[PDB]
Amino acid sequence: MQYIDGAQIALYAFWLFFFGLIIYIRREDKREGYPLESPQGPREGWPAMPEKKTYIHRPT
Amino acid sequence: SDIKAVPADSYNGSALIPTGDPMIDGVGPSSWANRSDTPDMTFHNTAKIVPMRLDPTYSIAKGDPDPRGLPVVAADKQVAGTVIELWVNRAEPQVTYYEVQLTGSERRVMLPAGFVQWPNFGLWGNDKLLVKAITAAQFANVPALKRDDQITLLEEDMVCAYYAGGHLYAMAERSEPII
Amino acid sequence: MHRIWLMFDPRRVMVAMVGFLAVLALVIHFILLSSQRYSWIENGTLSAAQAPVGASA
Amino acid sequence: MHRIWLMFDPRRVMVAMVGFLAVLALVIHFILLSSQRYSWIENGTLSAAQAPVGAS
Amino acid sequence: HRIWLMFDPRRVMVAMVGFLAVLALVIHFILLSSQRYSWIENGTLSAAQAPVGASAPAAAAEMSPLPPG
Amino acid sequence: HRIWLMFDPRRVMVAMVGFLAVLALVIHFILLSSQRYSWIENGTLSAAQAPV
Amino acid sequence: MHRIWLMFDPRRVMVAMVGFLAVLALVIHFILLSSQRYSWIENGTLSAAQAPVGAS
Amino acid sequence: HRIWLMFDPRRVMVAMVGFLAVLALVIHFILLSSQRYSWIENGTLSAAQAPVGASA
Amino acid sequence: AMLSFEKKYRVRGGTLIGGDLFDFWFGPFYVGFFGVTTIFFVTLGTLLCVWGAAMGPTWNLWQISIAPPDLKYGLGLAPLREGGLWQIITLCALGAFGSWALRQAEISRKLGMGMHIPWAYGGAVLAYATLVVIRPMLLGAWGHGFPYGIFSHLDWVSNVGYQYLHFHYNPAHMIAVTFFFTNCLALAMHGSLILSVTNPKKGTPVGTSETENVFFRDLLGYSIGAIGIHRLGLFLAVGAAVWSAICIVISGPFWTKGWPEWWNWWLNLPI
Amino acid sequence: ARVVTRDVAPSNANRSSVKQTEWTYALMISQSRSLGVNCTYCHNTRQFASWKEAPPARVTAYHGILMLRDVNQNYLSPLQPVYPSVRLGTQGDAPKAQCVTCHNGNYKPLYGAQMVKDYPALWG
Amino acid sequence: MLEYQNLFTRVQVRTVPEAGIEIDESTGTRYGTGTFSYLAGKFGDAQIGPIYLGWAGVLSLIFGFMAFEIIGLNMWASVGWDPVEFIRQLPWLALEPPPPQYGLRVPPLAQGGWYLMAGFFLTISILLWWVRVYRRARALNMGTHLPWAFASAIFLYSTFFFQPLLVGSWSEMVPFGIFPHLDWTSAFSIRYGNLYYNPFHALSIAFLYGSAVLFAMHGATILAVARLGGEREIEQITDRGTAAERSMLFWRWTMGFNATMESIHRWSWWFAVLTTFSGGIGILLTGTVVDNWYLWGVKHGLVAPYPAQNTLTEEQQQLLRGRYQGTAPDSFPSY
Amino acid sequence: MTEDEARRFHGYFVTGTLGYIIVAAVAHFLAWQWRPWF
Amino acid sequence: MTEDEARRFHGYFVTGTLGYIIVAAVAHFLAWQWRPWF
Numbered sequence A: 001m002q003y004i005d006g007a008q009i010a011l012y013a014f015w016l017f018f019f020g021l022i023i024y025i026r027r028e029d030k031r032e033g034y035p036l037e038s039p040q041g042p043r044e045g046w047p048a049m050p051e052k053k054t055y056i057h058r059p060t
Numbered sequence B: 001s002d003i004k005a006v007p008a009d010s011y012n013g014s015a016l017i018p019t020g021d022p023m024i025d026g027v028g029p030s031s032w033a034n035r036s037d038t039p040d041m042t043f044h045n046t047a048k049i050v051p052m053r054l055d056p057t058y059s060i061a062k063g064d065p066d067p068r069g070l071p072v073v074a075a076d077k078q079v080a081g082t083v084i085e086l087w088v089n090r091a092e093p094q095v096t097y098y099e100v101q102l103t104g105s106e107r108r109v110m111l112p113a114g115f116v117q118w119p120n121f122g123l124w125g126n127d128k129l130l131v132k133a134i135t136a137a138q139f140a141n142v143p144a145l146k147r148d149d150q151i152t153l154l155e156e157d158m159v160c161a162y163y164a165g166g167h168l169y170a171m172a173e174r175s176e177p178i179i
Numbered sequence C: 001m002h003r004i005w006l007m008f009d010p011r012r013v014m015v016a017m018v019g020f021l022a023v024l025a026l027v028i029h030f031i032l033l034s035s036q037r038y039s040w041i042e043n044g045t046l047s048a049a050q051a052p053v054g055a056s057a
Numbered sequence D, G: 001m002h003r004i005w006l007m008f009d010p011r012r013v014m015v016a017m018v019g020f021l022a023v024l025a026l027v028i029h030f031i032l033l034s035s036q037r038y039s040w041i042e043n044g045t046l047s048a049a050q051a052p053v054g055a056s
Numbered sequence E: 001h002r003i004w005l006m007f008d009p010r011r012v013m014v015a016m017v018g019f020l021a022v023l024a025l026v027i028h029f030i031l032l033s034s035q036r037y038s039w040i041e042n043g044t045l046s047a048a049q050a051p052v053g054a055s056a057p058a059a060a061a062e063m064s065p066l067p068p069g
Numbered sequence F: 001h002r003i004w005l006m007f008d009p010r011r012v013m014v015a016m017v018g019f020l021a022v023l024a025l026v027i028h029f030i031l032l033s034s035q036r037y038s039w040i041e042n043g044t045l046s047a048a049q050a051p052v
Numbered sequence H: 001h002r003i004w005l006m007f008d009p010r011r012v013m014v015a016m017v018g019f020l021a022v023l024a025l026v027i028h029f030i031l032l033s034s035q036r037y038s039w040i041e042n043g044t045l046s047a048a049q050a051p052v053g054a055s056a
Numbered sequence I: 001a002m003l004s005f006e007k008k009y010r011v012r013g014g015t016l017i018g019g020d021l022f023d024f025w026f027g028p029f030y031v032g033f034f035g036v037t038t039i040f041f042v043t044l045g046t047l048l049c050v051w052g053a054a055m056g057p058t059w060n061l062w063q064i065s066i067a068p069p070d071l072k073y074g075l076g077l078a079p080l081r082e083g084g085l086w087q088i089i090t091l092c093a094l095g096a097f098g099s100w101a102l103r104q105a106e107i108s109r110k111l112g113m114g115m116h117i118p119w120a121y122g123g124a125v126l127a128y129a130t131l132v133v134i135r136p137m138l139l140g141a142w143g144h145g146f147p148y149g150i151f152s153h154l155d156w157v158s159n160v161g162y163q164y165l166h167f168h169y170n171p172a173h174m175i176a177v178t179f180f181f182t183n184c185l186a187l188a189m190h191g192s193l194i195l196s197v198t199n200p201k202k203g204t205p206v207g208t209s210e211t212e213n214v215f216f217r218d219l220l221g222y223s224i225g226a227i228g229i230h231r232l233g234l235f236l237a238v239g240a241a242v243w244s245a246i247c248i249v250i251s252g253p254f255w256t257k258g259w260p261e262w263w264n265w266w267l268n269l270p271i
Numbered sequence J: 001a002r003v004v005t006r007d008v009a010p011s012n013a014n015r016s017s018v019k020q021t022e023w024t025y026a027l028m029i030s031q032s033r034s035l036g037v038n039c040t041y042c043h044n045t046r047q048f049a050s051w052k053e054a055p056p057a058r059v060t061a062y063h064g065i066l067m068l069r070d071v072n073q074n075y076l077s078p079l080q081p082v083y084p085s086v087r088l089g090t091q092g093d094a095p096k097a098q099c100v101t102c103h104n105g106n107y108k109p110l111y112g113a114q115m116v117k118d119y120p121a122l123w124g
Numbered sequence K: 001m002l003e004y005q006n007l008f009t010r011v012q013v014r015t016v017p018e019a020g021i022e023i024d025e026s027t028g029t030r031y032g033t034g035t036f037s038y039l040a041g042k043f044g045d046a047q048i049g050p051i052y053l054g055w056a057g058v059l060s061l062i063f064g065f066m067a068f069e070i071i072g073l074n075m076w077a078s079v080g081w082d083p084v085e086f087i088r089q090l091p092w093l094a095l096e097p098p099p100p101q102y103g104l105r106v107p108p109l110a111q112g113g114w115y116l117m118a119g120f121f122l123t124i125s126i127l128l129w130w131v132r133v134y135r136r137a138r139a140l141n142m143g144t145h146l147p148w149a150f151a152s153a154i155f156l157y158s159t160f161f162f163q164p165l166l167v168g169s170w171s172e173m174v175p176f177g178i179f180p181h182l183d184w185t186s187a188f189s190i191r192y193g194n195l196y197y198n199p200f201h202a203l204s205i206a207f208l209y210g211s212a213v214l215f216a217m218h219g220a221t222i223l224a225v226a227r228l229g230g231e232r233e234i235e236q237i238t239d240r241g242t243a244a245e246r247s248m249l250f251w252r253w254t255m256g257f258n259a260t261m262e263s264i265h266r267w268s269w270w271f272a273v274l275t276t277f278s279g280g281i282g283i284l285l286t287g288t289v290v291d292n293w294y295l296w297g298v299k300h301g302l303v304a305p306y307p308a309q310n311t312l313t314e315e316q317q318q319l320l321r322g323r324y325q326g327t328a329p330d331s332f333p334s335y
Numbered sequence L, M: 001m002t003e004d005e006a007r008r009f010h011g012y013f014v015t016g017t018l019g020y021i022i023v024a025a026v027a028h029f030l031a032w033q034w035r036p037w038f
C-alpha cells in the first residue's frame, strides 16, 4: 500500500529465509558431540539434534 | 574414574588435576581420539603414509636440506637423537613424520613434522631440527607402532597427541601463570 | 492413474507443491496489495465503479 | 553422414543444440522487442504502413 | 588427409564451429549497429534512400536524460 | 623441412593460426574505426570523395 | 662463432628472438600510426610537402 | 678471461642483453617524450629550428 | 552441559594470569582472569551505550548515535555531554577487545593448540585501534574517530571518504578491496570443495584428497594444498584488515589532497 | 545540474542518468579543487541534495555560479572582436572565467583580504 | 625459538606428477603432463599440473577472448592508437555504454555498439564457464556446490544487465575500465540517494565482513591444529580425531557454541553466497522500486537526526531551486 | 551404439530437423505478411 | 585413427566446407542485390 513497499517486503522475506537457514545450519552443527552431558541428564538446545548421518566408503 | 583425573574442589565447573603422568595416560592436551585401528589408504588402496625406503620414486626437492642424519635438539638444548628415515604422504606429496634413532640407539621413535622447526626459520644454515614440545628424556616414551612400514589412524593420533600435550606438561613451569 | 506415485516419492512431492503453492499465493497477494486498483486494505470498501482504473490510451 | 554419431555422442550433441537454439531464439525475440519497428507487444496492432521505419 | 592424424577431428570441429559462431555473431552485430545496414529498423528502404558516409564519431548526443519510460 | 624436427609442427601451426587471426582482426578493426576506410558506411564512395 | 649454439639452446633462442621482434615491430608501427606525420591510414595519400611537421 | 670462471657466462649474457635492451628502450622513449627530440614529428627540422627549453 | 568427549579436556593450567581461582567454566564458557576483565569492560561499555541512547532523542535502534567530541578539544577528555562519553566507551571497547584476545590465548594454551587465533583476531583489533586511536592521534584530536551508531557510523564513512573527493582512487584502498573480494571468492571455493567431496553425487562414495587436487587442476591447472588453502585464507582475510588500516591511516596524516591527484607520479614518469 | 529524485519511488519527474551524475561529479570535483576544499565543505554527503544539512557556504557557492553566468555572457564573451588573435582560443572565442580565476585554490580569494573598501570607484 | 607456525614448508617431496583420476575423455582431454614449481611448493602444492579442456572450456575461451579483444581495441583507439599513451593511461581508459536517449535500441558502433557486443560475448563466456565447472564437478562424481556458488556471483553480475533494462536504458550499464567502473560505482550510489541506506546493500556488507571473519577464524583454527593433523579435513569429518575435537572445544569455550568439521564449511559457503545474492537483490530494487534510498530510510526510521547546519528564507527557497540536468549544448554561441 | 544404431538415430534426427525448419519457414512467412523487414 | 579413417573424414569435411562457402556466396549475392556496400 502506501507505507508498505516492495523493498520492505523483500527484506522481510529475506529475514524469514535467513532464520530458516540459520536453523538448518545449527541443526547440522549438532551432528558431533551430542547429546550434551549434564548432571540433570541429556540436553539439547534449539534446534534439536538431527538423525544420525552415515557416510559411504569405497570397497577394499 | 576411567580418565585418571580428579576435580580440584567440589564446585561444579572446576578444572581437573591429573592423577598420574598426563603425557602417557592421555589427559587434557595429551588426549587422543579413538580413531580406527586401520591404516589410511590412498585412491588406489595403498598405505597413505609410508617411509621413503618403501617407495624409491620419492625424493627431496633441490635446494631443500636432507634432514636425514641431522641432530634433533629438544627443549633442553640437548640432542635427543638423529633423523634416519622420512615418512611421506602419498595422497598429497609431503613429509609427514621423521623417524629418530635415539642417542644410545636400541629404539626408533616417530616425530610429526608439525612440531619440527628449523634454525633461523629455515633461512640460514639448517644443521639441526628444533623440537620445542618435548624434552630429550620423554622422546623415549613416545608410543610405538605395531609394524615398521605402516601407521594406523589410531596410533597416528597417539603420537601427535603425545607431542602436543608436552607444551603443557614437559616441565612444571609450562603449566603455571606468568604473573 | 496412481502408478505415477511409484515414479515420484509422494512425501517429497507433496512437500514441494505445498511450498510452491504457498510462495505463489503470497506473491499474488502481495502484487495485488501493491497495485492501485486492488489495494484492498485501504480501498476495499469502494464499489467497482469507484475503484481505480489504469490510464486509457 | 550417419557416422557423425559415432564420432560425436548424440546425447551431448542434442543437449548442446537445444541450449544453442534456446539462447538464439531468446536473443532474436529480445532484439526485436527492444527495437522500434518490431516491439510487437505495444505496437503489434499497427498496419505495415503505420509501423516505424528508420530514417533515410 | 594426414592433417586429421595430427589433429583429432573431434577437437578441431569444436574450435572451428566456435570460431564461425563468434565471427558470424560479430559481423551481424556490427551491421546492426551501423546506420546503413541496421536492417531491423531500416531494411525496407531502397538502396538510394539508405544512409551513406555516416561515420560521424559524435553522430548522436552523448549527454541527455533517459527517455520518458 | 629440417625445421620441423626442431619445432613441433602441431604447436607451430596452432600458434600460427592464432597469431594470424588476431592480426587480421586488429587490422580490420583499425580500418573500421578510421574515417577513410570505414567501409560499412563509406564503401560506396569513390576515391575522390573518401576522407583525407 | 657457431659455438654459441651449444651454450644456448637454438630452439629457445628462436622463440625468444621472434617474440621480441614481433613486439618491437608492433610498437614501431603503432608509434608511427598515432603520430600526426605518419598516420598513413588517413593521410597516406598526402605528399611529403603536405605532411605535418612538428612546431619549431 | 678468468672472469668467466668466477661468473657463469650463460646468465651473464642473458643479464647483459636484458639490461642493454631495456636501457635502450628507456632512452629512446625519454627522447620521444621530449619536445626537442620528438623526432617522429619534428625530425625534419634543422638544429636552429629545434625547440629549446625554458631559459633564465 | 558438555560435549560427549569434553570431560577429559577440562583440565587446569594454561592461564597467563591467575591460578585455580579463575580456572573454571561458567556453563559452556571458560572463565579466566581475562574472562573476568572482559565482562567488566563489556558491562561498563554497554551500560554507557544505553545511557548515551537515553540522552539522545530516540530509542530507535537504527537512529541511536553516540558521537565523538568536537575537534576543538584536541586529544583531551571532553565533557561527557559533548563527546566525553564516546571516549569512555572507546576505552571500555579497547579493554574488552584486548581481554578477548588474551582470553583466547589462554584457551588455546590449555588445549595444546597454536597461537594463530589470537593473532588473527589482532588484525581486526589493529584496524579498530587505527580508526579510533592511531589516526586521531596523528591528526591531533579524538574527534576524528567514528560515532557509535548503526547507521550513524555509515554517515561518517561517507563524509570521510568524500573528504578526498574520490576514495576509490586510494591505492591502499584498492589493494584492500581486492583482498576482501578475493577472500570471499576463495572461501566460497573452499566451502564448496569440502562439501562436494563429503556430500558427493548420490550413491557414490565419499571422495579423497586426490579428488580435490585433481578437480582444481582440471578446472584451473593448479591446485593449492589442503594446508595451502587454509594458509591462503588466513593471509587474505587478515591482509584485508591490515591493508584497510594502512588505507585509512594514510588519508589525512600523510595525504591531504584528493586521491585522484595522487596518480601524478605515474603520469610524470620520465619515459 | 540536479540529478537526485525528490521522492521515494521513481517517476517521470526525474529521468537523470548515471552518466549525468558523473558529469555533475566532475563539475563538483573541479569546484572543490578551485577552492582547496572537499565535498563536505558544501555538503553532507549522506544526502547531496539537502540544503538544511549542508553548511551555508553552499548557498554562497550557488550565487557564484549565477555571477559567473553574468560575467561570462555579458562582459567577457562580447569582448571577442577586440582582442588580437593571440588572445583567443582555437575556435576564435574570447577568454572566459571560472571559480579558480578569483579563488586560485583558496576558500576565499587572497585568503579573504579586503582591498576594495579603500577604492570607492570600484564598487557600484 | 618460536614454535613451527605452519606458515611455510621447508622440506618438499618430489614424485612422478599426478596424471589424475580416470574420467570420460570423449568430449575433452587433459593437456600437459604436470610440472613442479619450487616457489609454489613453499606456500601450497608444487604441481602446475595438467588442465582439462572440453567443449564448454574452448567455447568459453573463444567468446571471452573476443570480448577482451573488443574492449582492448576500443581502449587503444580511444588514445589514437598511441602505445605509450595506451600503457600510460590504461587505468583511465574505458569502453563506454551507449547514450541515454537511445533507450534499449541499438546504438551506433562508435557510441555504444562495441560495448553491447563485448558485454554479450562476456556473458556467453561466463555461462559457458559455468557449464564447464558443472561438468568438471560431475565428472569426478562430486557434488555440485561450486556450480551454485558460482551461480550466485553470476546473479550479481547479471543484475548489472537487468537493472538498466528494467529502468529502460543501456546507458546505465557499467563501463569496461579500471577507474571508470569505480566512477560508475560512485555515480550510481550518488544518483539513487546514498546506497548506504539500501538494506540489501547493508546485508551484503554484513556478509562480506562475515566471510572475512569466517575465513580468518577457520584458517587460524586449522593452522593451530595442523600439528595434530587437522588439515586433513575429510578424515576428521568421516572419522573425528583429536584435532576436530580441540577445534570444537576451543570455539565452544570461547563463544558458548560451536560447529563441526563439516558444518563450518556450510557456514562459509552460505556467507559467501549470501553476499552476492543479497547484493543482487539490492541492485535490482534500485531505480525500479526505490529511487532515493536515503528517503526510504527516513521513511522506515533509519536516519539519525543532526542539528540543522543552515536555514533558508522563502525567497531563498525559491531561488535555490535549480533545474534537472538536460542535454549538452550542440552549438558554440557568439556574444 | 553400433553402425546400425547410428543409422536408426539419423533417420529420426533429419526428420526432426526438417520438421523444425519447415515450421520455422511458416513462422517467417506469417511474419512477412504482417510486417515485411525488406 | 587409421589412414583410411582420415581419408573418409577428409572427403566429407572438404565437401561440407566447400558447400558451406558456396551457400555463403549466394547469400552475399542476395545482399548485394538489396544494398551494395561498394
Ligand SMILES: CCCCCCCCCCCCCC(=O)OC[C@H](COP(=O)(O)OCC(O)COP(=O)(O)OC[C@@H](COC(=O)CCCCCCCCCCCCC)OC(=O)CCCCCCCCCCCCC)OC(=O)CCCCCCCCCCCCC
Residues within 6 Å of the ligand: B011, B012, B013, I001, I024, I025, I026, I027, I028, I031, I035, I036, I039, I040, I043, K255, K256, K257
Ligand atoms: C541465536 C540463537 C541462540 C541465542 C543464544 C546463544 C547462547 C550461547 C551460549 C549458550 C549457553 C547459555 C546458557 C548459560 O550460559 O547458562 C549458564 C547457567 C549455568 O551455569 P552452570 O553450568 O550452572 O555454572 C557452572 C559453574 O560456573 C558453577 O559455578 P557457580 O555455580 O559457583 O557459579 C558462580 C558464578 C555465578 O555467580 C554469580 O553471582 C554470577 C551471576 C551471573 C549472572 C547475573 C549477573 C548480574 C549480577 C552480577 C553479580 C552481582 C553480585 C552477586 O560466579 C561467578 O563469578 C561466575 C563467573 C561470572 C562472570 C565473571 C565475573 C565477572 C565479574 C565482573 C562483572 C560483574 C557483573 C557486572 O545457566 C543459566 O544461567 C540458565 C539460563 C540460560 C539462558 C540465558 C537466560 C538469560 C536471561 C536474561 C536475558 C537478557 C537478555 C538481554
Ligand SMILES: CCCCCCCCCCCCCC(=O)OC[C@H](COP(=O)(O)OCC(O)COP(=O)(O)OC[C@@H](COC(=O)CCCCCCCCCCCCC)OC(=O)CCCCCCCCCCCCC)OC(=O)CCCCCCCCCCCCC
Residues within 6 Å of the ligand: A016, A017, A019, A020, A021, A024, C012, C015, I195, I199, I200, I201, I202, K142, K143, K144, K145, K148, K151, K152, K155, K277
Ligand atoms: C536467483 C539465482 C541465485 C543463485 C543460484 C541459486 C541456485 C539454487 C541454490 C539452492 C541452494 C543450494 C545449496 C547446496 O548446497 O547446493 C548444492 C547441492 C548439491 O547436491 P547434489 O550435488 O545434487 O547432491 C549432493 C547431495 O547428495 C548432498 O547435498 P548437501 O547435503 O551438501 O546439501 C543438499 C541439501 C541437504 O540434503 C539433505 O538434507 C538431504 C538428506 C536426506 C533427506 C533429509 C530428510 C528428509 C526430509 C524430507 C522433507 C524435506 C524435503 C525437501 O541442502 C540443501 O538443499 C540446502 C539446505 C539449506 C537451505 C534451505 C534452508 C531453509 C530455507 C527456507 C526457510 C523458510 C522459513 C523458515 O545442489 C542442490 O541442488 C542441492 C539440493 C537443493 C534442494 C532445494 C532446491 C530448492 C529450489 C527452489 C526453486 C525451485 C523452482 C521454483
Ligand code: BCL
Residues within 6 Å of the ligand: C017, C018, C019, C020, C021, C022, C025, C026, C029, C032, C038, C040
Ligand atoms: C485482492 C485480493 C483478495 C483475495 C483474493 C483471493 C483469491 C481470488 C484467492 C485467494 C486465496 C486465498 N487467500 Mg486471499 N484475497 C484477499 C485477502 C486475503 C487475506 C487478508 C488478510 O485480507 C488473507 C489472509 C487471505 C488468505 C487466503 C488464503 C485462505 C487462500 C490461499 C491459500 C494458500 O496459501 O494457498 C496456497 C497453499 C499451498 C500451495 C499449500 C497449503 C494448502 C492448504 C490445503 C490450503 C488451505 C486453504 C483453504 C482451506 C483451502 C481448501 C483446502 C481443502 C479443504 C483441502 N486473502 C483479497 C481481499 N484470495 C486463494 C484460495 O485458494 O482461496 C481458497 C484464491 O483462489
Ligand code: BCL
Residues within 6 Å of the ligand: I157, I181, I184, K067, K068, K071, K122, K126, K153, K154, K156, K157, K184, K185, K186, K187, K188, K189, K190, K194, K195, K196, K198, K200, K201, K204, K205, K208, K275, K276, K278, K279, K280, K282, K283
Ligand atoms: C560511493 C560508492 C558506494 C557503493 C556502491 C556500490 C554499488 C553500486 C555496488 C556495491 C556493491 C557492493 N559493495 Mg558498496 N558502495 C559503497 C560502500 C561500500 C563499503 C564501504 C567501505 O563503505 C563496502 C565494504 C562495500 C562493499 C560492497 C560489497 C558487499 C558489494 C559487492 C559484492 C561483491 O562481491 O562484489 C564483487 C562481485 C561481483 C561483481 C560478482 C560477479 C563477478 C563476475 C562473475 C566476474 C567475471 C570476471 C570475468 C570472467 C573476468 C574479467 C573479464 C574481462 C572483463 C574481459 N561498499 C558506497 C556507499 N557498492 C554491489 C552490490 O551488490 O550492491 C548492493 C554493487 O553493485
Ligand SMILES: CC[C@H]1c2cc3[nH]c4c(c3C)C(=O)[C@H](C(=O)OC)c4c3nc(cc4[nH]c(cc(n2)[C@@H]1C)c(C(C)=O)c4C)[C@@H](C)[C@@H]3CCC(=O)OC/C=C(\C)CCC[C@H](C)CCC[C@H](C)CCCC(C)C
Residues within 6 Å of the ligand: I181, I182, I184, I185, I188, I189, I219, I220, K060, K061, K063, K064, K065, K068, K122, K125, K126, K127, K129, K130, K133, K146, K147, K149, K150, K152, K153, K272, K273, K275, K276
Ligand atoms: C561467492 C561470491 C564470490 C565469487 C564466487 C565464485 N567466482 C567463481 C566461482 C565462484 C564460486 C567459480 O567457480 C569460478 C571459478 O572458476 O573460479 C576459479 C569463478 C570465477 N570468478 C572469477 C572472477 C571474479 N570473481 C569475483 C567475485 C566473486 N566470485 C564473489 C566475491 C570478481 C570480482 C570481485 O569482481 C571477479 C573478477 C573468475 C576467475 C571465475 C570465472 C571465470 C569465467 O567465467 O571466465 C570466462 C572466461 C573468460 C572471460 C576468458 C578470458 C580471456 C582472457 C581475458 C584473455 C587472455 C589473453 C592472453 C592469453 C593473456 C592476457 C593476460 C591478461 C588478461 C592479464
Ligand SMILES: COC(C)(C)C/C=C/C(C)=C/C=C/C(C=O)=C/C=C/C(C)=C/C=C/C=C(C)/C=C/C=C(\C)CC/C=C(C)/C=C/C=C(\C)C(=O)O
Residues within 6 Å of the ligand: G001, G003, G004, G005, G006, G007, H020, H026, H027
Ligand atoms: C636519464 O637517462 C638515464 C637512462 C637515466 C641515464 C642512464 C644512465 C646509466 C646508468 C647508464 C648506464 C650505462 C651502462 C652501464 O655501465 C652501459 C653499459 C654497456 C655495456 C657494458 C655494453 C656492452 C655490450 C656488449 C655486447 C652487446 C657484447 C656482445 C657479445 C656477443 C654477441 C658475442 C658473444 C658470442 C660468443 C661469445 C660466441 C662464442 C662462443 C664460444 C667460444 C663458446 O660457446 O664456448
Ligand SMILES: COC(C)(C)C/C=C/C(C)=C/C=C/C(C=O)=C/C=C/C(C)=C/C=C/C=C(C)/C=C/C=C(\C)CC/C=C(C)/C=C/C=C(\C)C(=O)O
Residues within 6 Å of the ligand: H002, H003, H006
Ligand atoms: C638526495 O640524494 C642524492 C642526490 C642521491 C645524494 C645522495 C648521495 C649518496 C648517499 C651517495 C653515496 C655514494 C657512495 C657511497 O659511499 C658511493 C660508493 C661507490 C663505490 C664504493 C663504488 C665502487 C665501485 C667499484 C667497482 C666499479 C669495482 C670494479 C671491480 C672490477 C672491475 C674488478 C672485477 C674482478 C672480478 C669480477 C674478478 C677478477 C678475479 C679473478 C678472475 C680471479 O680471482 O681469478
Ligand SMILES: COC(C)(C)C/C=C/C(C)=C/C=C/C(C=O)=C/C=C/C(C)=C/C=C/C=C(C)/C=C/C=C(\C)CC/C=C(C)/C=C/C=C(\C)C(=O)O
Residues within 6 Å of the ligand: D024, D027, D028, D031, E024, E025, E028, E029, L005, L008, L009, L012, L013, L014, L015, L016, L017, L020
Ligand atoms: C539478431 O542478430 C543476430 C542474432 C546476431 C543474427 C545472427 C544469427 C545467426 C548467426 C544465426 C545462426 C543460426 C544457425 C546456425 O547455423 C542455425 C542452425 C540451426 C539448426 C542446425 C537447427 C537444427 C535443429 C534440429 C532439431 C530441432 C532436431 C530435432 C531432432 C529430434 C527431436 C529427433 C528426435 C528423435 C530421436 C532422438 C530418436 C530417438 C532415439 C532412438 C530411436 C535411438 O537411440 O535408437
Ligand SMILES: COC(C)(C)C/C=C/C(C)=C/C=C/C(C=O)=C/C=C/C(C)=C/C=C/C=C(C)/C=C/C=C(\C)CC/C=C(C)/C=C/C=C(\C)C(=O)O
Residues within 6 Å of the ligand: D001, D003, D004, D006, D007, E020, E023, E026, E027, E030, F021, F024, F025, F028, F029, F032, M005, M008, M009, M012, M013, M014, M016, M017, M020
Ligand atoms: C570488423 O570486421 C571483422 C569481423 C573483424 C572482419 C573479419 C575478418 C576476419 C579475420 C575474417 C575471417 C574469416 C575466416 C578465417 O579464416 C573464415 C574462414 C572460414 C572457414 C574455414 C569455414 C569453414 C567451414 C567448414 C564447414 C562448415 C565444414 C563442415 C563439414 C561437415 C559438415 C562435414 C563433417 C561431417 C562428417 C565428417 C561426417 C562423416 C564422418 C565420418 C565418415 C566418420 O566419423 O567416420
Ligand SMILES: COC(C)(C)C/C=C/C(C)=C/C=C/C(C)=C/C=C/C(C)=C/C=C\C=C(C)\C=C\C=C(C)\C=C\C=C(C)\C=C\CC(C)(C)OC
Residues within 6 Å of the ligand: D027, D030, D031, K068, K069, K071, K072, K073, K075, K076, K116, K117, K119, K120, K123, K157, K158, K160, K161, K173, K174, K175, K176, K177, K178, K181
Ligand atoms: C594489444 O592489446 C590488445 C588490444 C590486442 C589486447 C589488450 C587488451 C587489454 C589491455 C584489455 C583491457 C581490459 C580491461 C582493463 C578491462 C576492464 C574491465 C573492468 C574493470 C570491468 C568491470 C566491470 C564491468 C561490468 C560489470 C560489465 C558488465 C556488462 C554486462 C552485464 C553486459 C551485458 C550485455 C549483454 C547481455 C548484451 C546483450 C546484447 C543484446 C543485443 C542481446 O542486448 C543489448
Ligand code: HEC
Residues within 6 Å of the ligand: I165, J001, J002, J003, J004, J024, J025, J028, J029, J030, J031, J032, J035, J037, J038, J039, J040, J041, J042, J043, J048, J049, J050, J057, J058, J059, J061, J062, J065, K190, K322, K323
Ligand atoms: C561548494 C563550493 C561546493 C562544493 C565544495 C561541492 N559542491 Fe556539490 N553543489 C554545490 C552547489 C552550489 C550545487 C547546485 C549547483 C546547481 O547548479 O544546482 C551542488 C550540487 C551537487 C549535486 C546535485 C544535487 C542534486 O540535487 O542533484 C551533487 C550530486 C553534488 N553537488 C556533489 C558534489 C560532489 C561529488 C562534490 C565534491 C567533488 C561537491 N558536490 C562539492 C556546491 C558545492
Ligand SMILES: [Fe+3]
Residues within 6 Å of the ligand: I190, I194, I230, K218, K222, K233, K265
Ligand atoms: Fe577448511
